[PDB]
Design a protein around this ligand. Structure first.
Ligand SMILES: CC(C)CN(C[C@@H](O)[C@H](Cc1ccccc1)NC(=O)O[C@H]1CO[C@H]2OCC[C@H]21)S(=O)(=O)c1ccc(N)cc1
Lengths: 99, 99
């Protein structure tokens, strides 16, 4: 599909057997999701943006379905104000910017 | 053009007669640029990102050219980690997400 940018590009995602709303974010290197209890091992990480840094938990090879498009890769989990789908998964669903 | 997301979507912008590099950021409501001298009045504002809130100078009705496409809109100037082009300007240049 084509998504205009009049409003936040929020879409439904499926991760760990749960449906969530997440931002399709070309400005995010990696996907970061609001705090959630994912099983498995993880590695601590810090990501920086407007306002400074937050501490997140990096999970690898996590399966996410974005608008029926399946993807698998790194998913960060931490105190983000919004669920964010980053370029690491946007490339996997064939997402492009167009103007 | 069509821009894939294997790398950061960085583009050259022109603002205040000066060239700069900026990130096309569909996850940003607003456009935030690093510290710079701009003409015209400005009002102090607050903006929040993943790590908290920062103080910025708000410039309205500023001409800014993004990859040869002209826009006139609000530009926030402050201690952002990187120049980000947000939806307020992405819409003006006719930018959409496609997959
Ligand atoms: C600032 C960017 C270079 C990086 N950010 C992605 C960006 O799209 C955030 C993503 C974002 C969106 C909402 C809330 C927090 C973070 N948007 C943002 O900061 O925009 C601000 C200016 O316009 C306003 O609208 C949103 C917040 C303001 S980030 O959230 O900090 C980030 C950094 C690293 C990763 N792996 C994932 C995300």
């Amino acid at each position: 599909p084509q998504i205009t940018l009049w409003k936040r590009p929020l879409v439904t995602i499926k991760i760990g057997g749960q449906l969530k709303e997440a931002l399709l974010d070309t400005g995010a290197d990696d996907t970061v999701l609001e705090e959630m209890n994912l099983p498995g091992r993880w590695k601590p990480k810090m990501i920086g943006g407007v306002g400074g840094f937050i501490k997140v938990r990096q999970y690898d090879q996590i399966l996410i379905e974005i608008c029926g498009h399946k993807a698998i890769g790194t998913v960060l989990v931490g105190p983000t104000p919004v669920n964010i789908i980053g370029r690491n998964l946007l490339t996997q669903i064939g997402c492009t910017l167009n103007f």
